[PDB]
Amino acid sequence: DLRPLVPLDGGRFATSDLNDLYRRVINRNNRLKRLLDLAAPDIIVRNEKRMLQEAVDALLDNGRRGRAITGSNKRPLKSLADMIKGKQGRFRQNLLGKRVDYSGRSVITVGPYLRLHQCGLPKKMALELFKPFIYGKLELRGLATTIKAAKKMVEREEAVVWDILDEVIREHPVLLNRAPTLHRLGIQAFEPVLIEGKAIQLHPLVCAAYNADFDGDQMAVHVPLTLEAQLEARALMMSTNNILSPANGEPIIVPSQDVVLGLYYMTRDCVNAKGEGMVLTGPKEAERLYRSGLASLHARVKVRITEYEKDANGELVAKTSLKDTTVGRAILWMIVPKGLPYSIVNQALGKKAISKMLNTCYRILGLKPTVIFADQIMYTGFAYAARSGASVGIDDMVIPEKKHEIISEAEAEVAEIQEQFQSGLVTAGERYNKVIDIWAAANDRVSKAMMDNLQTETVINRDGQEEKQVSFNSIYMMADSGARGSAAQIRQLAGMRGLMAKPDGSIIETPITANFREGLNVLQYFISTHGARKGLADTALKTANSGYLTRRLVDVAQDLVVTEDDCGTHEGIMMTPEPLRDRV
Amino acid sequence: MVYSYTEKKRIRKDFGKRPQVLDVPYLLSIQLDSFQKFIEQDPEGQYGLEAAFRSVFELQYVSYRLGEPVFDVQECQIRGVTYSAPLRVKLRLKEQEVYMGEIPLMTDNGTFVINGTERVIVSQLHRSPGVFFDSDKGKTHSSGKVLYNARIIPYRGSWLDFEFDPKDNLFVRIDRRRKLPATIILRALNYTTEQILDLFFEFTNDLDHGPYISETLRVDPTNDRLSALVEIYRMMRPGEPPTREAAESLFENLFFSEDRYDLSAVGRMKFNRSLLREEIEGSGILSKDDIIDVMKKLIDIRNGKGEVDDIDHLGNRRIRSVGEMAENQFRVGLVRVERAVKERLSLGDLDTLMPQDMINAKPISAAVKEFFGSSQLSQFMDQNNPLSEITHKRRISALGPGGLTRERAGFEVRDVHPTHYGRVCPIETPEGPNIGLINSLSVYAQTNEYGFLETPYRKVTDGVVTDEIHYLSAIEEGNYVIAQANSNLDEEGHFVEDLVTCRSKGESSLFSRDQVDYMDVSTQQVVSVGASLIPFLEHDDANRALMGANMQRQAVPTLRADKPLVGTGMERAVAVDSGVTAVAKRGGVVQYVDASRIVIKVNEDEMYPGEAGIDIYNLTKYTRSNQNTCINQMPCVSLGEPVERGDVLADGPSTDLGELALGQNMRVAFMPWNGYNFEDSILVSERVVQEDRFTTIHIQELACVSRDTKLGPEEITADIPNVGEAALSKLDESGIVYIGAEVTGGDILVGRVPNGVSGTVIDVQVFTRDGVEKDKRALEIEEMQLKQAKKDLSEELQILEAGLFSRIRAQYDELKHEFEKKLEAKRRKITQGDDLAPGVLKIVKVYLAVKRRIQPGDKMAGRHGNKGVISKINPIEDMPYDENGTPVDIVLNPLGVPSRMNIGQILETHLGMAAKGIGDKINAMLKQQQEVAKLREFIQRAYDLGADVRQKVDLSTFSDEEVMRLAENLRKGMPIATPVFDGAKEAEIKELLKLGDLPTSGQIRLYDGRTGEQFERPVTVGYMYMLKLNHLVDDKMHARSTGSYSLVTQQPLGGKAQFGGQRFGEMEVWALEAYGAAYTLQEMLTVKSDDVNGRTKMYKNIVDGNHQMEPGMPESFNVLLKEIRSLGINIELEDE
Amino acid sequence: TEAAVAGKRDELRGLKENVIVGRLIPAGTGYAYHQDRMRRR
Amino acid sequence: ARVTVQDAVEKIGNRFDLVLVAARRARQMQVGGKDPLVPEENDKTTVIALREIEEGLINNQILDVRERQEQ
Amino acid sequence: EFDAIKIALASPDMIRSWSFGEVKKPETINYRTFKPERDGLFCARIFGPVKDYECLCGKYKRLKHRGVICEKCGVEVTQTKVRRERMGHIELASPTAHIWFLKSLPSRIGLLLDMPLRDIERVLYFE
DNA sequence: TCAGCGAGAGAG
RNA sequence: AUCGAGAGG
DNA sequence: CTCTCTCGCTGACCTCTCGATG
Ligand SMILES: Nc1[nH]c(=O)nc2c1ncn2[C@@H]1O[C@H](COP(=O)(O)OP(=O)(O)OP(=O)(O)O)[C@@H](O)[C@H]1O
Ligand SMILES: [Mg+2]
Ligand SMILES: [Zn+2]
């Protein structure tokens, strides 16, 4: 039965390779039997003896001495030694991994309303995944007697099973997994919320740990069965226990993109905005004034603030004063937990500032307040990013007015340096470096002019006079807040694309003097494709190196466990400064 | 310009500025032209079947011809057979005509029907035959000294390599075998040491001359010819049976026999040109002079009087198409016949024998049908939309029989080469393991008579550019100076500037007016067909352009076709050349039209003598494609209309009045909305769903076969044990479902509907052989197919019969006899039998059709590499709106634009807003019922806008009815065309916006639909073209609790088709180990898989309300123990 | 081959061996379990 | 007990023993038949056991003493 | 119920003790009638019943007969799962080497003795 | 193919 | 079941 | 004793569709 004969829809059968090698060996061995009885001359016998040892070597390990035997097709047959070794052998395909029951798979979308410990599960999947529990709860209440009545009731989809299912998932966690599992944060435990539809909803704050996106991605779901498994899921793998990385110390749940943009927009300030110069009794008055339409989010005002600080014994002591701030910061102050200073929000916030806020809260207050603080931060960021109406247009990509003069001067310089080569005055290999340096300097000049024109643009009127301030450009705000942009890519958008390289690695003499707002021509576009294809091929053809290295590293050190409490030895190493604090 | 009838109904406005001097060619020439030179008669006998017959032909061959196919394409597709023709050959020994076999035929669009399915043969790019000199750069030896080598490659035969050694010694290899000293081969050609020294020496330097031959002779352990032959024989064939006759024959047949070696005409030409000879013709076999010349050239390169070749140069690789591979396979099949003929010609007989007795047609047919159906280059054709087929038919592959391998291929062959300019697209390529190994043909590219790609250029004479066009190849163009296509010319053809940007010798620079030789023909010469459909491509990054070109081929046709407002101008060419429409063969007047048939009455000056003169077009209705999609044709002409030649009479899938149309036009705003477009999510309105703008039709097939098993015979009947009477309601008296029945999951069709799948029955087919017995429904339906098919043919012939009868009655017996003969022939063709498989009596096939609507979890994309998944369907009173109360359709996140530098998607959004703005102004004028003069004035002002464009439309020559019809067709927006590298500027877009009474920034004020408050900044709103890709969440959701298991390893099966489970691999086990969850790991390893008793105990315990497990031992460990014991090794468990 | 020649024994003291056989790994919530076995040997 | 289990970890001592103690306590209520020491509040046995551990009414020594008393 | 795994070379007596049946010369399943050949690769006597608690001939079809071999067939009545367990053996008519112990980088069957791999391989292949 | 390593003959 | 071809993350 | 030089031998995540052959 370990080498069975499988019937087909037609009369014919499908057989294994082993049954052929056995028959070959049997036939040849029986052929040797007749020769001994007939007393054939040893010349004929010696040929047959060489034959049998050729057959056996095929059955044990085919191809050690090249004589590979094939079948109906021109493909080598598989020996016994081929079924226990390799990537498709018993060890690596059936014993270190396998397929399981109570599992499912689907596409993932976003749910912006969930709490950190929740997930959204379709009820069509949930009904199938939890069938025995429903059968048991049906038999318990007497609604069915046999084991087929419950099956019929579930198949007919009556109106009473939709409450049993709600009762049997109330506090039962599930496991979610994404296919490339690079570290242990690739499997996590959540609590299901029954939804309509066919897609799974995932919390926005857990994407970075999964390396997940909403472009077509998929995910798998598993169900724990025993009490010990449920308690292990709740106490070890639940997403509210995994907030710091195990490879370093920094947190892993961090806001990004829309949340960063929203908080950054609230916490900025302007000059001569509506309602500037008021004195307020607290944050609630600021919220009233903003909602009524009587003040701007960016107005500079005075507000009375109360804060708390911890003493030596661990108790909280209050302190009240008046502070210079803005309406948006006073509004944001209402979600900060007690025990933190007011200076932590009296500035414009970016990615680093928000991450530092979360880390400080965890350091001072503990674990439970941090989850609430993170969820409130996400809600407020989503709420206030939409109210701003931030967009993108073609007029936001501003090109400096001095680009033409710089480019013309560089061209004149490189044209003049050819006169030193027409009449011998420089090495034939020396003009190359001079031209490269000239073009690099011109590129730097153009980039600096563009960035100086973009970052600061106010020309604003303050009570009569003219003043300058940080700009409110959409692209500049996106780059400065740390949401998506980089200063290098704004160069390609509105400066110069720069110098390209040949496929071998040399530098092309003349650069690309066009950005993406004003298009490229055929030659520049043709030149730009070498690097694109090279990068794509590099990405595609060297994931296997990393996979192989990781597998070897896991196999070498897989059996090292902490098995003792104190060794007692006095040895050590001496650490020197990278700061010293980060190293000890 | 004079406009065609199809194009005068809706004229696209063009923004291009450079005049066109050459037309886009027919896009399917590479297949039809190749297959033509395989079956057409060639008196010079050098291309196809004639060459193969003359290359092997005692028996005398006279001629050949091809017969008439038994069935046509449609009947072959319906029945499930191959569309082929018989091959007849005339031989003399007496004169007789014999039968050789069946040759598959190519259809009108460049495909093959093999077993009822359409297939495509992909062209191959491979190394050319000849001689090549190469050298490894380094790392062969630690000394860091380069080594030079030379190789000879024929079309057929064995290889030959010469190479050097770290000690400067010559060595030779045959068929990649072990090395031998070189001079041995010289000794095998009747040369003594004196003659060798005379050949290679005249004196021995140390920098420009070398003693390499003398030292090699020193190391050579041979001094006689026979010693050389025996050494070669021992090296080639171990075993050493040295005989004088054996040694001579091997060397004679190795390189000097016409039946074992062939250096083709192209190989001869390249070989001669590499050695700087004069003639380009010769023989297919080698000679001593050739080998000596190769040795001298290699030695000279070693000395320093030459250079090595580039292996990736596109002048060294050539193209092989289907008409060549078919000939190769036919010759392979033919050489097996002659052995049998020679064997049967030695038995001894006369008089009674005939040529047919010595010919067996099995091997030839076997080889041909193996190639057409089992080759790696014969592929299941891609049929998602019209663009997919065009892209598939124009593909080039570096893999195949004489090709490369995915894993062994390095990095240099996958790169873009400077010689690809104008021949291979540098953008469109797969993104997986096949990157760089699959390519697409450029728009104007061709091949010459040897098989090398070439591209066209304009001749320049005395400083003026003319209209004379020459096709140049990679070798030729390196000796010239070629100017770009965007150079400025005056009315006399002179260059305006004194310095021109030009290409020469693989570099680019500036040249004078009088140093230029040629010029480009177009600005879209370097891209492929798919990449030329992306507007504003020059504002996009190359990675995103690749993504968009690839994703444009996955779109699904919708219920209604909708043209793009912003296009490039290549839609008509693709739509017409694809072959999915109906095109008029001759001009005339429409006589009859309904939903499934068109009749044309031909003009007087296009009729042959003695002809009735009507054309009949039948249309395809609700047929499934290879991807389970829908194919449907719809007429687009009215009764009594005049038609010219080449006009579109009906539309195919994804076509709108003769233009390609893959998606829908949507109103979009760029802004964030409450986290519902967080990463790449898309928020959609409910009005989109209510209007069915992304609803698709899918068709599925199911089969039922009753076996002829001897144990129990089975037949189709209504009676079924243990079923209700309601179950048989949809079944007829014969047990087959009615047409028009609405079924759902778990219903009997022929007794069967797969779980979760619904639909409607639209087609039932019955297949029977020449056997016995028949059913009532088959008598009612299978006979109904034949009677209906006869009725359609009778109706078609009736029109011609009536016309001829009316003409005559104004020799009827001859006409009546002819028409009766035609009817009898049609009936006989329709009444033939079917050849089934043994053990099968009859087959029943059922077709189902279902409709699919969008829902959260479906994938959408544009043309610029932007893709996403739908997250929410929003009520209409929640969407943002404007000052007139108009809401938007789609909301997209701006944060996805600045990181991926695809700026073009913004520019399109600005232009589409302008286009719609024109249509609105027309729409109002049609509601108020104004006079034709005002419409004329406004439309003329609209068509004249631009900065020195080349279109020049004039409406003063239009009739009033024509103007009204154009205005009616223009009332939903004015279409606009912008070529890939010669398009519209920002200033022109702003002028169009101003003409439409819209802001020139492209941004307006919006209000919140839930509170009525105004957003704080202006937002970008416009129109953009969206696509629906074939990744539907209905096909991806799956779940399981318990089911079926495998046989050897008692583990769950895999795959949604067979209700399988998910795989828990090694990396997941590592993750669970790193968590510390031992009980979860043990539960997954045993009781959910491989534990036969534990699984049952766990199930019973769960049903009883007790959550506890009793693990045991997995079965795979027992299997492994038995398997290891079968190798003769004792392995066991130590209980004590 | 080397193991069959030498005649070796395996005590199943690592993670992979217990995974292959199908027992509790000697780490985490299973660690204490293995501590009992040594106490009974 | 809900959302976060950090309270019981500081009382038992480590995460790997809390799972075993909670499972031993919960199996008594689910199958053996026993009454909770806290209001049920419509909870599963695992959550009730975690709540009892958090309050301070359950640990290994108490269960051992009760088992000795029963026999 | 176990605590270690042992591995070692086998001997003819051990292999004979594993087997439930003698050598098997016939080939296959008799494609015409699916019942297996006697004394073959698929054989009911050597390896076990084809169906649960049923004889090949069919004389005994009850649990009361459990543990009884058939006089006319020689087939025991037992659960069919034993077909996954029982093994067999073949009697070679001449000694044959083991490819694993001959071909390797540190060859074993040729390291106990002095001679290298080339000449010993020549001897084994009758040359 | 390409990179890496050990077993085996050489010429001093 | 194996082989070949293609697609998605 | 001890560098050169041939010459083999072993290695390079998850999911879906089609057809031809057993
Ligand atoms: N061959 C491969 N092997 C592998 O082991 N993992 C692969 C993979 N190919 C894709 N992935 C996964 O897919 C993610 C990026 O692919 P993608 O969804 O498009 O997002 P991307 O970041 O590129 O941004 P976008 O294209 O939307 O602009 C990538 O990390 C990875 O997990
Ligand atoms: Mg993704
Ligand atoms: Zn019996």
In the block, tokens 């009883």 appear at B1104
How far is residue A320's CA from residue A402's CA, in Å, rounded to a whole number? 53
3-state helix/strand/coil string of B200-229: HCCCCCCCCCCCHHHHHHHHCCCCCHHHHH
Question: Three-state DSSP class for B441?
Answer: strand
The B 1052-1081 residues near strand F by Cβ under 7 Å are none
Q: For residue B702, how far is the Cα from the chain centroid? A: 27
Token readout for B569 is 């101008």
What spatial distance separates the first Cα and last Cα of chain D, rounded to whole Å?
31
Hey, what are A494's tokens? 């509105």
HSE value, Cβ hemisphere, 13 Å, CA-based, for B741: 21
**Cβ atoms of B942 and B951 closer than 8 Å:** no
- Contact at CB, A53 and E100, closer than 8 angstroms: no
Of C20, C23, C27, the CB nearest to B1076: C27
A226 three-class SS: coil
Domain count, chain D: 1
Q: Does A416 touch chain C (CB under 8 A)?
A: no
Same domain, B806 and B821: yes
The 3-class secondary structure across B896-931, one letter per residue, is HCCCCCCCHHHHHHHHHHHHHHHHHHHHHHHHCCCC
Of D6, D42, D44, the CB nearest to A368: D6
Beta-bridge partner residues of A318 = A308
From the number of C-beta atoms within 10 Å of its C-beta (0-12, 13-18, 19+), residue C35 rates as: exposed
Q: From the CB of residue A248, how many other CB atoms can be counted at a distance below 10 Å?
A: 7
> Distance from the CA of A212 to the center of ligand 1, in angstroms?
9
E strand segments, A67-173 = 98-99, 103-110, 118-122
Cβ–Cβ < 8 Å for B364, B370: no
Nearest to B1035 by CA among B1053, B1054, B1056: B1056
Answer whether A544 contacts ligand 1 (Cβ < 6 A). no
* C-alpha span between A521 and A476 (Å, rounded): 28
In 3-state terms, what secondary structure has residue B737?
Answer: strand
> Cα A515 vs. chain centroid, distance in angstroms?
30
Output the furthest CA–CA distance in chain A (Å, rounded): 127
Distance between the alpha carbon (CA) of D8 and the C1' atom of F12, Å: 79
Residue (of B484, B444, B492) closest to B465 by Cα position: B492
Sign of CA dihedral B377, B381, B385, B386: positive
Structure tokens at B1057: 């088709």
Among residues B310, B340, B367, the one where a domain terminates is: B310
Q: Same domain, yes or no, for B120 and B153?
A: no
Strand F, nucleotides covered by protein (CB < 7 Å) = 1-3, 6-9
Of all helices (H) and strands (E), which one includes residue B397?
strand B395-397
- Yes or no: say if B696 and B627 are a contact pair by the CB < 8 Å rule: no
Q: Are strands B696-707 and B840-852 parallel, antiparallel or unpaired?
A: antiparallel
C-alpha–C-alpha distance, residues B785 and B787, integer Å: 6
How far is B1025 from B662, CA to CA, in rounded Å?
9
Which bound ligand lies closest to the C-alpha atom of E73?
A: 3
Q: Which residues contact B809 (CB under 8 A, 6 or more apart)?
A: none
Which DSSP helix (H) or strand (E) runs through D43? none
In this structure, how many other beta carbons lie within 10 angstroms of the beta carbon of residue A6? 9
Per the listing, tokens 């009315």 go with B491
A103 - beta bridge partners? A222, B1040
Encoding tokens for residue E45?
A: 């006597």
Is ligand 1 within 6 A of the CB of residue A211? yes
Residue A15, token pair as written in the block: 């057989």
Do strands B1019-1028 and A13-14 pair parallel, antiparallel, or not at all (unpaired)?
A: unpaired
A399 closest CA partner among A501, A516, A511:
A516
What distance in Å separates the CA atoms of residue A173 and residue A189, rounded to the nearest whole number? Answer: 6
Domain total for chain B? 8
B645 and B664 Cβ atoms separated by less than 8 Å: no
3-state secondary structure B764-811: EEEEECCCCCCCHHHHHCHHHHHHHHHHHHHHHHHHHHHHHHHHHCCC
Listed in sequence order, the residues at least 6 apart from B374 whose beta carbon sits closer than 8 Å to its beta carbon are none
Each as own residue / partner, the long-range contacts of residues E27-36 (CB below 8 Å, 24 or more positions apart, any chain) are E27/A23, E27/A26, E28/A19, E28/A23, E29/A5, E31/A13
Q: Tell me if C22 and B1117 make a contact (CB, 8 A cut-off).
A: yes
Helix (H) or strand (E) holding B433: none
Compute chain B's Rg from CA coordinates.
37
Listing DSSP states for A191-207 in one string gives EEEEESSSSEEE-GGGH
CA distances from A405 to A193, A412, A497, A499 (A): 63, 10, 17, 19
Buried b (16+ CB within 10 A) or exposed e, A434-451: ebeebbeebbebbbebbb
Q: Map A494-517 to HEC letters.
A: HCCCECCECCCCCECCCCECCCCC
Give the CATH number of the domain where residue B484 resides: 2.30.150.10
Residues B890 and B764 in one domain: no
Rounded CA-CA distance B426/B414 in Å is 11
Structure tokens at A547: 């996979």
Identify the bridge partners of residue E4 per DSSP, sorted by sequence position: B1134
**Tokens for E79?**
């659960």
For residue B129, give every residue at least 6 positions away whose Cβ sits within 8 Å of its Cβ, in sequence order, or none.
B153, B154, B155, B263, B264, B266, B267, B270, B271
Three-state DSSP class for residue B1097: helix
Helix (H, G, I), strand (E, B) or coil at A149: helix
Please report residues of D whose CB lies closer than 8 A to that of A140: none
Query: Do E and C have ≥3 inter-chain CB pairs under 8 A?
Result: yes
> Which residue is nearest nucleotide H8, judged by alpha carbon to C1' distance?
E105
Identify the H or E element spanning E1: none
Verify whether the Cβ–Cβ distance A64 to E103 is below 8 Å: yes
Q: How far apart are CA B226 and CA B188, in angstroms?
A: 8
* Token pair of B326 as six digits: 């078919």
| C-alpha span between B10 and E104 (Å, rounded) | 79
**Chain E CB contacts of B1092 below 8 Å:** none
Tell me how far apart the alpha carbons of residues B1088 and A99 are, in angstroms, rounded to a whole number. Answer: 8
Q: Are residues B725 and B780 in the same domain?
A: no
Residue by residue, DSSP assigns A409-447 as HHHHHHHHTTHHHHTT-S-TTTHHHHHHHHHHHHHHHHH
| Chains A and B share 3 or more Cβ pairs within 8 Å | yes
Q: Which residues are bridge partners to A202 per DSSP?
A: A110
Please give the Cα distance from B113 to B78 (Å, whole number).
Answer: 11
**CB burial class (10 A; 0-12, 13-18, 19+) of residue A329?**
buried
CATH code for position B701: 2.40.50.150
Taking a C-beta distance cutoff of 8 angstroms, is the pair B242, B233 a contact?
Answer: yes
Q: Supply B890's token pair.
A: 């789609």
State CA B861 to chain mean position distance: 22
The tokens of A178 are what?
A: 């994404």
Task: Write out the H or E segment, with its range, that includes residue B712.
Answer: none
Whether residue B489 is contained in a domain is answered as yes
Residues B861 and B929 grouped into a single domain: yes
Dihedral of CA atoms A467, A473, A477, A480 in degrees, nearest 10, equals: -70
Following CA atoms B466, B472, B476, B482 in sequence, which dihedral angle do they give, to the nearest 10 degrees?
40
Taking phi over 0 as left and psi of -120 to 50 as alpha, with beta for the rest, B1015 belongs to: beta
Which domain covers residue D5, as residue numbers? Answer: 1-71
CATH code (residue B642): 2.40.50.100
Amino acid at B1136: E
Number of H helices, E strands in chain C: 3, 1
For B266, residues 6+ apart whose C-beta sits below 8 A from its C-beta are B128, B129, B318, B450, B451
Cα angle B317, B319, B324; round to 5 = 135
Query: DSSP string spanning A287-300?
Result: HHHHHHTSS-TT-E
Phi-psi region of B127 (alpha: psi -120 to 50; beta: other; left: phi over 0): beta
Give the bridge partners for B592, in sequence order.
Answer: B599
- Could you give the CA distance from residue B605 to residue A512 in angstroms, rounded to a whole number? 59
Residue length of chain B: 1136
Length, in residues, of chain E: 127
CB A213 near ligand 1, within 6 Å: yes
Give the phi and the psi of residue B899 in degrees, each rounded to 5. -80, -50
Burial of A269 (0-12, 13-18, 19+ CB in 10 A): buried
Element (H, E) at A317: strand A316-326
Distance of CA B540 to the CA centre of its chain: 26
Question: Nearest-CA neighbor of C21 among A22, B877, B1113?
Answer: B1113
Which DSSP string corresponds to D15-63?
HHHHHHHHHHHHHIIIII----SS--SS--HHHHHHHHHHHTS--HHHH
Same domain, B981 and B1028: yes
Task: Give dist(CA B538, CA B983) in Å, integer.
Answer: 9
Rounded Cα distance between E41 and E55, Å, is 19
Choose among B232, B235, B196, B231: nearest CA to B216: B196
CB within 8 Å of B230: residues ≥ 6 apart:
B242, B247
Q: Are B1026 and B862 in contact (CB under 8 A)?
A: yes
Q: Which domain holds residue A472?
A: 394-535
Could you tell me the CATH number of the domain that includes residue D34?
3.90.940.10
Question: Is there a domain that residue B1044 lies in?
Answer: no
- Residue B1118's contacts (CB-CB under 8 Å, 6 or more residues apart) are E84
Say which residue the tokens 């080339």 belong to: E118
User: At CA B287, angle to CA B285 and CA B292, rounded to 5?
Assistant: 140
* E48 to chain A: closest CA residue: A1
The residues after which chain A has a C–N gap greater than 2.5 Å are 577
Contact state of B1081 with C25 under an 8 Å Cβ cutoff: yes
- DSSP class of residue A70? B
Q: Which residues numbered 1065-1104 in B keep a CB inside 8 Å of some CB on D?
A: 1076
User: Which DSSP symbol is given to A186?
Assistant: G
Q: What is the Cβ-side half-sphere exposure of residue B567, based on CA atoms within 13 angstroms?
A: 25
Q: In the numeric block, which tokens belong to residue A457?
A: 């643009």
**Distance from C-alpha of B1080 to C-alpha of A100, rounded to nearest angstrom:** 12
Q: Which resolution in angstroms does this entry have? A: 2.7
Collapsing DSSP to helix, strand or coil, B1125 comes out as helix
Under DSSP, is residue B293 helix (H, G, I), strand (E, B) or coil? helix
Question: Which structure tokens are listed for B576?
Answer: 């017409």
Q: Are residues B781 and B766 in the same domain?
A: no
| Residue in A325, A220, A50 with CA at minimum distance from that of residue B1084 | A220
Output the domain CATH number for residue A483: 1.10.132.30
DSSP letters spanning A533-559:
HHHHHHHHHSHHHHHHHHHHHHHHTTT
Question: Taking the CB of residue A180, how many other CB atoms lie within 10 A of it?
Answer: 10
Count Cα atoms within 13 angstroms, Cβ side, for A184.
19
Rounded to a whole number, what is the distance in angstroms from the first to the last CA of chain A?
61
Do B423 and B452 lie in one domain? The reply is: no
Instruction: Please give the residue range of the domain that contains residue B762.
Output: 695-772+834-852
Cα E60 to ligand 3 centre (Å) = 7
Q: Are B147 and B140 a contacting pair, CB within 8 Å?
A: yes
- The residue whose two tokens read 């400080």 is A360
- The helix (run of H) or strand (run of E) holding residue B1000 is none
Measured from the Cβ of residue B611, the count of other Cβ atoms closer than 10 Å reads 9
CB contact under 8 A, B1106 and D16: no
Contacts of D36 (CB under 8 A, 6+ apart): D29, D48, D52
**Per-residue exposure over B513-551, b if at least 16 CB sit within 10 Å of its own CB, e if not:** eeebbbbbbbbbbbbbbbbbbbbbbbbbbbbbbbbbbbb
C-alpha–C-alpha distance, residues B259 and B252, integer Å: 11
Q: Which atom of ligand 1 is nearest to the CA of A216?
A: 18
Q: Decide if A203 contacts A117 (C-beta within 8 A).
A: no
Q: What CA–CA distance (Å, rounded) separates B263 from B286?
A: 8
- Hey, whose CA ends up nearest to atom 22 of ligand 1? A213
Nearest atom of ligand 1 to the alpha carbon of A217: 18
Residue B8, token pair as written in the block: 């005068």
C-alpha torsion sign, points B655, B660, B665, B671: positive
Are residues A48 and A31 in contact, defined by beta-carbon separation less than 8 angstroms? yes
Residues facing C29 on adjacent strands: none
**Domain for residue B9, yes or no?**
no
Residue B72: count of CB within 10 angstroms of its CB? 10
Give the Cα separation of B802 and B797 in Å (integer).
9
Asked if B624 and B384 count as a contact pair (C-beta separation under 8 A), the reply is no
* Angle formed at CA E38 by CA E35 and CA E43, multiple of 5 degrees: 70
A181 CB under 6 A from ligand 1?
A: no
Could you give the CA distance from residue B650 to residue A156 in angstroms, rounded to a whole number?
A: 47
Spell out which residues of B between 400 and 459 contact strand H, using CB within 7 Å: 407
Kindly report the CATH number assigned to the domain that includes residue B542: 2.40.270.10
Q: Give the CA angle between residues B880, B885, B887 to the nearest 5°.
A: 40
What is the rounded CA–CA span in Å between residue A231 and residue B252?
82
Asked if B672 and A386 count as a contact pair (C-beta separation under 8 A), the reply is yes
Q: Are B699 and B622 in contact (CB under 8 A)?
A: yes
